[PDB]
Coordinates of C-alpha atoms in Angstrom, one line a residue:
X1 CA 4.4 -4.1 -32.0
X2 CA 1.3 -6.0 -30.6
X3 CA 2.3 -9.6 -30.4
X4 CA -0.3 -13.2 -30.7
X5 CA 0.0 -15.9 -28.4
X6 CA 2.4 -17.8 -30.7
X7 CA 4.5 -14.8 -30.8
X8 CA 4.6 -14.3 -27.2
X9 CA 5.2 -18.0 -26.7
X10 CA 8.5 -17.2 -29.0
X11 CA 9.1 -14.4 -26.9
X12 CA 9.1 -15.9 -23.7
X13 CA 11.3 -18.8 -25.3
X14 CA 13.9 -16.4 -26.5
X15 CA 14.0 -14.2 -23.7
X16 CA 15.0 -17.5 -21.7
X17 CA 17.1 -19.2 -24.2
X18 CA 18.7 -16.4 -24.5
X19 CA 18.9 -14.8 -20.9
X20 CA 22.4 -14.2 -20.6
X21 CA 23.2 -11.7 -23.5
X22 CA 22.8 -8.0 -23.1
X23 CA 19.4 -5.9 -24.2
X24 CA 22.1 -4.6 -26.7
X25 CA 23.7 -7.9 -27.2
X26 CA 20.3 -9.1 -28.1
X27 CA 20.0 -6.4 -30.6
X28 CA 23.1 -6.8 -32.4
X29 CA 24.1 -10.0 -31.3
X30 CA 24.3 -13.9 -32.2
X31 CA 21.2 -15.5 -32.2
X32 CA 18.4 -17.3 -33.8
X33 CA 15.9 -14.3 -32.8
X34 CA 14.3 -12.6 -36.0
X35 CA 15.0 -8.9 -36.4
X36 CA 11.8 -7.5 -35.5
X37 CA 11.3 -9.7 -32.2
X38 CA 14.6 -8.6 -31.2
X39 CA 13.0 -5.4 -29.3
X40 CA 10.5 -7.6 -27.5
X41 CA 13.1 -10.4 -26.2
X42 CA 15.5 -7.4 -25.2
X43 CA 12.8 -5.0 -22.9
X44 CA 11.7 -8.6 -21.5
X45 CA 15.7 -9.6 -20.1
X46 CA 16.1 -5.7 -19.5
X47 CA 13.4 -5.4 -17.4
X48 CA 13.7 -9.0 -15.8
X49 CA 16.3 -7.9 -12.6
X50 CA 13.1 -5.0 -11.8
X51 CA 10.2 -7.6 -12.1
X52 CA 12.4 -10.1 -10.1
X53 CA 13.1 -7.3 -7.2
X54 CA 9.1 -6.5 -6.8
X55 CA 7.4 -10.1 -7.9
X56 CA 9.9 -12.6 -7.1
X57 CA 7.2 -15.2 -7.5
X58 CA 6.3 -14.0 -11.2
X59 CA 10.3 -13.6 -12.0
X60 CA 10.2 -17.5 -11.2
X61 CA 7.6 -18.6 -13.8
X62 CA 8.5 -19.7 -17.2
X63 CA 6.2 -18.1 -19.9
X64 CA 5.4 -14.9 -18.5
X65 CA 5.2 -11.9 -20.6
X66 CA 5.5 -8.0 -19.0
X67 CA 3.8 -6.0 -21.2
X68 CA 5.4 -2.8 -20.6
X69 CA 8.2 -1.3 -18.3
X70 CA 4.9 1.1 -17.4
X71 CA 2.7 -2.0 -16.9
X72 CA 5.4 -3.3 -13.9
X73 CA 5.9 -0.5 -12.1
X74 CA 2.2 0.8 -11.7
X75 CA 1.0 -2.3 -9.8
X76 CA 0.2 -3.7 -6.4
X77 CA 3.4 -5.3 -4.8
X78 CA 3.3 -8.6 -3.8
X79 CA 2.3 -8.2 0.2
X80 CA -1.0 -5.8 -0.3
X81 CA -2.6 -7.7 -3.4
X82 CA -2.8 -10.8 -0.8
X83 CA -4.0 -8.6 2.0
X84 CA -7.1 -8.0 -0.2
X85 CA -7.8 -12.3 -0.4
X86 CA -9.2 -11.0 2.9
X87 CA -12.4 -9.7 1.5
X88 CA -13.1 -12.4 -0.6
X89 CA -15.1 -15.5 0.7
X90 CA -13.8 -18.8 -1.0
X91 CA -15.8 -19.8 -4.3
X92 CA -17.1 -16.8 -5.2
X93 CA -17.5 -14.8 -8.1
X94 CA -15.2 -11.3 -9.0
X95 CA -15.0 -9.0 -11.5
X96 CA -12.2 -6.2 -11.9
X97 CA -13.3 -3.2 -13.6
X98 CA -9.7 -1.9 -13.9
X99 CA -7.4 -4.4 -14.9
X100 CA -3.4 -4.0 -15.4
X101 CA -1.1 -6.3 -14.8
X102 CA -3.6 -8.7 -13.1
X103 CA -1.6 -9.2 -9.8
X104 CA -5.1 -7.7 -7.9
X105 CA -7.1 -9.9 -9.9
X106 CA -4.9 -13.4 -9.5
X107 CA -5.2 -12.2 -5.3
X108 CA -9.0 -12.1 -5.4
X109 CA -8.8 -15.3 -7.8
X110 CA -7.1 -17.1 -4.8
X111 CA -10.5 -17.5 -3.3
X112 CA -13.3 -16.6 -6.0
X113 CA -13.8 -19.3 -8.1
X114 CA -15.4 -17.5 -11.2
X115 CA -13.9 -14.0 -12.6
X116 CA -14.2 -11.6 -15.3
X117 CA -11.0 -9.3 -15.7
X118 CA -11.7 -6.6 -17.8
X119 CA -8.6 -3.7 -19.1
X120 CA -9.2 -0.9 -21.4
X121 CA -5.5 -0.9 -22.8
X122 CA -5.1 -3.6 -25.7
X123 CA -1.4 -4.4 -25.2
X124 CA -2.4 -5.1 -21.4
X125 CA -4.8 -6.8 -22.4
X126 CA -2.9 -8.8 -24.3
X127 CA -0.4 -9.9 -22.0
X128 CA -3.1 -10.6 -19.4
X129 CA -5.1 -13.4 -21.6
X130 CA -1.9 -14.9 -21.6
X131 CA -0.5 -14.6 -17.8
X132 CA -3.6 -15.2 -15.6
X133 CA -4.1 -18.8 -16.8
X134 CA -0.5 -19.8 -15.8
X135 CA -0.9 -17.8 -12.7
X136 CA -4.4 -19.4 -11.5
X137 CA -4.6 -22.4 -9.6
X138 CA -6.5 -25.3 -10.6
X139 CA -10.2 -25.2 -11.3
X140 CA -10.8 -21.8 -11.7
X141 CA -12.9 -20.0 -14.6
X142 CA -12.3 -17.2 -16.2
X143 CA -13.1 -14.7 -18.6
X144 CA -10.2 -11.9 -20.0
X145 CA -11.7 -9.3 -21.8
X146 CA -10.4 -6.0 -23.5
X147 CA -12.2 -2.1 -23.5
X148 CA -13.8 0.1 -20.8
X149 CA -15.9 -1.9 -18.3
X150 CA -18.9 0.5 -19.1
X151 CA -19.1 -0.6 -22.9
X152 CA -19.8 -4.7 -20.6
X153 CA -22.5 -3.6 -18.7
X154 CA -25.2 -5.8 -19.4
X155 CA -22.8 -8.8 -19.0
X156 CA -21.2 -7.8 -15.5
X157 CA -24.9 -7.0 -14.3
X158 CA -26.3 -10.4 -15.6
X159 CA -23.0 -12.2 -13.9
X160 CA -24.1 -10.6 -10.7
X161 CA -20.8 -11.4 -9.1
X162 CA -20.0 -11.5 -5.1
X163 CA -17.8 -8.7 -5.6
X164 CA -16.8 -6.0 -8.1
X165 CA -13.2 -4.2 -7.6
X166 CA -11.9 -1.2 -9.1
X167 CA -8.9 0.8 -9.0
X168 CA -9.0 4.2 -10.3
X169 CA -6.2 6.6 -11.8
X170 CA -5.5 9.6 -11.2
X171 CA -7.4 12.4 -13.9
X172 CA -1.2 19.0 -6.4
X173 CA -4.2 17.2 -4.1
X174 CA -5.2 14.0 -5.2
X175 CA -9.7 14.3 -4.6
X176 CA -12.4 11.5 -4.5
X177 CA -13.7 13.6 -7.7
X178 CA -10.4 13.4 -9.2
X179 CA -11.2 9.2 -9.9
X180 CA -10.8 7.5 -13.5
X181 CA -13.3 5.8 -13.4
X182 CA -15.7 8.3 -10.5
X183 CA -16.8 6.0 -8.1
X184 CA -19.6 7.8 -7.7
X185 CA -21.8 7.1 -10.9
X186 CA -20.3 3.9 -10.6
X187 CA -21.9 2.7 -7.1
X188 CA -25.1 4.1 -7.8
X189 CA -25.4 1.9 -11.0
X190 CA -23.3 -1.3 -9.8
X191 CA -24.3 -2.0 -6.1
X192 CA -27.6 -3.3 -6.8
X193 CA -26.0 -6.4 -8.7
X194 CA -23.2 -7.2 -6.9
X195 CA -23.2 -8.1 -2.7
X196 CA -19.7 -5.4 -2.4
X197 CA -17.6 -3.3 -4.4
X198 CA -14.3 -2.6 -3.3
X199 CA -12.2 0.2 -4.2
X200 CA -8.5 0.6 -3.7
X201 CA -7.4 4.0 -3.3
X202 CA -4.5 5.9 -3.8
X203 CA -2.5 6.8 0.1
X204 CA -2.6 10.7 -1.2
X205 CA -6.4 10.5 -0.9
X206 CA -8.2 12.1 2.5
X207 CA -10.0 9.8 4.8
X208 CA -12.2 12.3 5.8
X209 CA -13.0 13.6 2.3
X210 CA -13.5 9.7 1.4
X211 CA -16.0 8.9 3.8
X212 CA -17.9 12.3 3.2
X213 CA -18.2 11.7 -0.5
X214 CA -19.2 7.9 -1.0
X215 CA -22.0 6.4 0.0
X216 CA -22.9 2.9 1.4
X217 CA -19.1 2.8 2.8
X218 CA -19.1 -0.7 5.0
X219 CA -15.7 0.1 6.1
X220 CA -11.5 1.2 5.6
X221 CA -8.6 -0.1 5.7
X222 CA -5.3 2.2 5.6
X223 CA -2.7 -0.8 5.0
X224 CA 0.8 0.1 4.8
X225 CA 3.6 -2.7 4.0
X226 CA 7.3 -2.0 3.8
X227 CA 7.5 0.9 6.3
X228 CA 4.7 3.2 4.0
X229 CA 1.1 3.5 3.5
X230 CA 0.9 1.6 0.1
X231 CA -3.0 1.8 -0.3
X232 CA -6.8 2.7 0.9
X233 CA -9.4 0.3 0.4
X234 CA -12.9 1.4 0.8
X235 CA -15.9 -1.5 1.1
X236 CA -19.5 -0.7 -0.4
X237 CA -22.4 -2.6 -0.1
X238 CA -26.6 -1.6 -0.5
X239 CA -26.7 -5.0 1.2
X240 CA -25.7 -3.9 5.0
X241 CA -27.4 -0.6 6.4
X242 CA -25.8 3.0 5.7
X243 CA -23.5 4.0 8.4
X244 CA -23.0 7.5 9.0
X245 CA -19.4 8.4 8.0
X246 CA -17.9 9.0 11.6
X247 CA -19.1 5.9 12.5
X248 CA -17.4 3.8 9.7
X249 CA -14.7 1.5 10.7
X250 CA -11.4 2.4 9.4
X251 CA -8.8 -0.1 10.3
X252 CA -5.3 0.5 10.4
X253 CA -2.8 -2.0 9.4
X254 CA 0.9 -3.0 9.1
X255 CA 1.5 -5.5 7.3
X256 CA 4.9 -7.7 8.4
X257 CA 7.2 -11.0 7.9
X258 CA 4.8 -13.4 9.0
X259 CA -0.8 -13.2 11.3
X260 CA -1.1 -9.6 12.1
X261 CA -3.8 -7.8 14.0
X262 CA -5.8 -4.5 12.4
X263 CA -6.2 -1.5 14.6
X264 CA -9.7 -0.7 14.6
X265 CA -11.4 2.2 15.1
X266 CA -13.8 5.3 14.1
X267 CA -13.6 9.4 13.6
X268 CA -16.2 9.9 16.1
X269 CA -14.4 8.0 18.9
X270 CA -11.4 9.4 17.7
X271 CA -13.1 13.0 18.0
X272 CA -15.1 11.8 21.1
X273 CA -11.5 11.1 23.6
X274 CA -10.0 13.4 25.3
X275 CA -6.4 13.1 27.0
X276 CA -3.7 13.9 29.0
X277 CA -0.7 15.7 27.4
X278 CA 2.6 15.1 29.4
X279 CA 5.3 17.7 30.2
X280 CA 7.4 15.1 31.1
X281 CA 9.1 11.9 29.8
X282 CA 8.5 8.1 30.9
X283 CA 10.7 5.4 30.6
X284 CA 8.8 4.0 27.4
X285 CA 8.5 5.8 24.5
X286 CA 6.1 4.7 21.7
X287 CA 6.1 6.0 17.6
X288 CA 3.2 5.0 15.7
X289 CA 3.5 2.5 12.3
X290 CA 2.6 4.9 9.3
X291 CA -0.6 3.3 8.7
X292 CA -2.1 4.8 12.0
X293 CA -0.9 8.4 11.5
X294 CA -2.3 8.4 8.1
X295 CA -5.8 7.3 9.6
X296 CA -5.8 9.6 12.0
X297 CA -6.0 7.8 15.2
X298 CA -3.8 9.8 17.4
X299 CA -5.7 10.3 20.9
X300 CA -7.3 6.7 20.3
X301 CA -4.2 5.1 20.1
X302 CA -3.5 6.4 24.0
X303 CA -6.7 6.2 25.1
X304 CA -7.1 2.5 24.0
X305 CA -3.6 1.7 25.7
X306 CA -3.4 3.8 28.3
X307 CA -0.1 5.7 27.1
X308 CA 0.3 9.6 27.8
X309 CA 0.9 11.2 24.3
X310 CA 3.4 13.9 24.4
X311 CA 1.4 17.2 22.5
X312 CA -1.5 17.1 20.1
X313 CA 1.0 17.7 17.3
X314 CA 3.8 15.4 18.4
X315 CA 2.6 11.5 17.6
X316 CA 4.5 10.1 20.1
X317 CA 3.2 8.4 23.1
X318 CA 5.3 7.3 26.9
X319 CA 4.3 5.1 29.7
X320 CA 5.7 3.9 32.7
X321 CA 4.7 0.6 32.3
X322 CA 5.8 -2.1 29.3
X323 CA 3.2 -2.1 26.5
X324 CA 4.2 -4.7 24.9
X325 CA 2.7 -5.3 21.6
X326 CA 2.5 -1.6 20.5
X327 CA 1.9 -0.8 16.7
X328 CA 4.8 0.7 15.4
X329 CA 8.3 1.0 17.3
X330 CA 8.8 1.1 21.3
X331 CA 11.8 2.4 22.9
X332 CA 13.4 2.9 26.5
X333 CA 14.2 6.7 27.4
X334 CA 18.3 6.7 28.4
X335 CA 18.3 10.9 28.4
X336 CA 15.8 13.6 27.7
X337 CA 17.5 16.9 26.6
X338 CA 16.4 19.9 26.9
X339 CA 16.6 21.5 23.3
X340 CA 18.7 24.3 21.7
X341 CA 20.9 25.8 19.1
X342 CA 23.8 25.4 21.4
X343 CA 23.1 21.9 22.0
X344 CA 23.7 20.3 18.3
X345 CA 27.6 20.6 18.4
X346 CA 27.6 18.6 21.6
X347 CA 25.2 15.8 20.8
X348 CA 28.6 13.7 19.4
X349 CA 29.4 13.6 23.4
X350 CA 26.1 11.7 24.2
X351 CA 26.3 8.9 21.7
X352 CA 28.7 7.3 19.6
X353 CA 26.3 7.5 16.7
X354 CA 22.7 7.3 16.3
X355 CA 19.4 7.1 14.0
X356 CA 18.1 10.3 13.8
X357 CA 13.4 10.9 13.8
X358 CA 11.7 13.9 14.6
X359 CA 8.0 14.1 15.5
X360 CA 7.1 17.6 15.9
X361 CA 9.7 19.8 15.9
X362 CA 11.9 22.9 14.0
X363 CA 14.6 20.8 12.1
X364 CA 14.4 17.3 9.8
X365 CA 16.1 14.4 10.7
X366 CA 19.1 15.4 8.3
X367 CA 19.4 19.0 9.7
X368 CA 19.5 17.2 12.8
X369 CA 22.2 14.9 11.8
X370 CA 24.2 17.5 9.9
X371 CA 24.5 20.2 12.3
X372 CA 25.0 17.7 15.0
X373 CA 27.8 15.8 12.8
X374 CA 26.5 12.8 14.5
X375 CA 27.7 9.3 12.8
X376 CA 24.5 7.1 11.3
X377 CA 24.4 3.6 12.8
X378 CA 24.2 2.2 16.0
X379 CA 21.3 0.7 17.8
X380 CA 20.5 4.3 19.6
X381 CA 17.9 6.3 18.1
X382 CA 17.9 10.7 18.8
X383 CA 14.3 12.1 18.5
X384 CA 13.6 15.5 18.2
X385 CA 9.9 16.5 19.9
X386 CA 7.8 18.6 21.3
X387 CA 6.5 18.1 24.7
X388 CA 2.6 19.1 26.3
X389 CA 4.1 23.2 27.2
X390 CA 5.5 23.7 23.7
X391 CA 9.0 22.9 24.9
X392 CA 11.9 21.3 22.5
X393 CA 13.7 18.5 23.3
X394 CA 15.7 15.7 22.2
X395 CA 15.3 11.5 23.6
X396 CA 18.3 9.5 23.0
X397 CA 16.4 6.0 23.0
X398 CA 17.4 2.3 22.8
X399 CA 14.9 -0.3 21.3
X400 CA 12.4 -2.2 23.8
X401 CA 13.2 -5.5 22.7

C-alpha cells in the first residue's frame, strides 16, 4: 500500500494517538483507525523502539513516516552522516544520487543551502518528500525527486552543484567493480559539472584496490564510530591535480563522545618506513582504534610516535615513555608471560578476572577465556601476542588512565 501525504499525515496521527496498543492490538483492537491503515499504523509503533535506539533525534519528531523496516536499518547512523557536514562548505549546492532514508542528505543539507535528492525506489521516495522538509532547517531549498539519477541528467548537469554524493550497493569480496551505481562511468561523465563527488563506501571494500581503480581521488577517510569501521569515503575532483594513488591522503578516524583529530597519512610513506621490531616488553602498551588497522597504517603509526611495534603481524605497539594521546587504547604492562598449553589452566592464579584481546596469536579471545576459565570483568585486560622472534606470550595489562 503506497500511501499520499494526507494518508501519511493520518498515519503519523494514528501511530501517535494510538502509541500505546500493541502492533496486534492495533490490528484487532479498539480504535478509530480504518481497516486498511491498520497495517501501516502497526509496522510504524512496531518498529518505533528500533528507530528510537539508532535515530533518537528522528524517534523525537512528530510526523515522521519510516517507510520500511528495510529503509531503517540500511542507513547511516546518526554519528557518521554528520562527520560528512565536514566536506561541505556552508551555502552550497548538493545533490544525492542515491537517496534512502535521507539521513546523508539532511547531514550535507546542514551546510548546503540548495539540494536535489534523488531515489530510485517509489515508496522511499515517498516517505522522503515528506520527512526532509520537517527535518531541514530554516531557509533551505529543495528538490525530492523519484527514479534512477541517470534518467536526470541534463537537470543535475545544468544545476552544476558544489557537490554530488553517491552511495552504492552492493551488485564473498565486496570489489570497486561490484558498485550499483559503477563509479567509474559515473566520474568520467559527472566531474566536469560539479567541483567534488563524494562516494561513501562500504568498510568490506580494499583501500588499495580503491585507490588503484578510481581516478581523480583528492583523498580517504576510513571513519569508524562505535568501536567499528562504519564507512569509506572517497573525494573526487577534475578541479585539483591527479595525485598518484600512494600518494593520496587517507585519514583515519575515530569518531567519540565529544572535536577529534584524523590520523593522516599515505601508502607510500606507510611503504617507505622501516622499524624496529621488539623482543621485549615496555611498560606501555598501545592497541590501535579499528579505523587505523583497516587503513593500513601499521609501521606509520610507530614511526610517527616513536613506539616499538611488537612484530609485523602483531598491531600492537610499547614504549617506555607515556604517549599520551594515542589512537586507540593504552595500557601499563603488570606481567609478560611466556606462552603455552600448560599455562591456560593457571592464568585464574594471575588475576581475579579479566578482558580477554589477542593481536597475533594461535587462539581467539574466547578460546582464551574458555580454556583458561578466566571470569569476564574487571578493569585488567590479558592479551595474547606475538613478539619480534615469533615467540607467544600473554600481557596482563591495566588501563593508562
Amino acid at each position: 500500500m503506497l500511501f499520499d501525504e494526507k494518508e501519511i499525515l493520518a498515519i503519523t496521527r494514528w501511530a501517535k494517538l494510538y502509541a500505546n496498543q500493541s502492533p496486534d492490538r492495533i490490528l484487532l483492537g479498539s480504535n478509530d483507525i480504518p481497516p486498511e491503515y491498520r497495517a501501516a499504523v502497526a509496522t510504524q509503533i512496531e518498529l518505533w523502539p528500533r528507530l528510537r535506539n539508532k535515530l533518537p533525534q528522528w524517534a523525537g519528531i512528530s510526523s515522521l513516516y519510516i517507510p520500511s523496516r528495510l529503509s531503517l536499518e540500511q542507513s547511516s547512523g546518526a554519528v557518521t552522516s554528520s562527520y560528512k557536514s565536514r566536506f561541505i562548505r556552508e551555502g552550497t549546492k548538493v545533490v544525492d544520487l542515491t537517496g534512502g532514508l535521507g539521513i546523508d542528505f539532511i547531514a550535507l543539507m546542514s551546510k548546503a543551502s540548495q539540494g536535489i535528492y534523488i531515489e530510485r525506489n517509489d515508496e522511499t521516495a515517498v516517505a522522503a518528500r515528506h520527512n526532509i522538509p520537517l527535518l531541514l532547517n530554516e531557509g533551505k531549498d529543495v528538490n525530492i525527486l523519484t527514479g534512477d539519477f541517470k534518467e536526470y541528467l541534463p537537470l543535475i548537469k545544468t544545476f552544476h552543484p558544489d557537490y554530488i554524493y553517491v552511495d552504492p550497493a552492493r551488485r564473498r569480496v565486496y570489489a570497486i567493480a561490484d558498485c550499483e551505481p559503477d563509479l567509474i562511468p559515473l566520474a568520467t561523465e559527472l566531474l566536469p559539472f560539479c567541483s567534488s563527488i563524494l562516494a561513501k563506501l562500504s568498510p568490506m571494500i580494499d583501500l588499495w584496490d580503491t585507490l588503484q581503480s578510481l581516478l581523480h581521488v583528492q583523498e580517504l577517510h576510513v571513519v569508524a564510530a562505535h568501536g567499528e569501521v562504519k564507512e569509506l569515503l572517497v573525494r573526487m575532483s577534475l578541479n585539483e591535480a591527479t595525485i598518484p594513488p600512494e600518494k593520496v591522503p587517507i585519514h583515519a578516524i575515530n569518531l567519540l563522545l565529544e572535536t577529534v583529530i584524523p590520523f593522516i597519512f599515505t601508502m607510500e610513506e606507510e611503504r617507505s618506513i622501516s622499524i624496529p621490531y621488539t623482543d621485549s616488553i615496555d611498560k606501555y602498551v598501545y592497541e590501535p582504534h579499528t579505523a587505523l588497522l583497516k587503513a593500513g597504517a601499521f609501521k606509520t603509526v610507530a614511526y610517527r610516535l616513536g613506539l616499538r611495534k611488537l612484530h609485523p603481524n602483531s598491531h600492537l605497539y610499547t614504549s617506555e615513555a607515556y604517549e599520551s594521546a594515542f589512537p586507540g587504547r593504552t595500557f601499563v604492562l603488570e606481567e609478560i608471560i611466556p606462552f603455552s598449553t600448560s599455562v591456560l589452566k593457571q592464568l585464574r592464579k594471575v588475576v581475579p578476572q579479566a578482558s580477554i584481546s589477542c593481536r597475533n596469536f594461535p587462539l581467539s579471545p574466547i578460546e582464551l577465556r574458555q580454556r583458561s576459565k578466566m571470569a569476564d570483568g574487571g578493569e585488567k585486560t590479558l592479551m595474547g601476542t606475538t613478539m619480534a622472534d615469533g615467540k607467544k606470550v600473554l600481557l596482563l595489562l591495566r588501563k593508562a588512565e
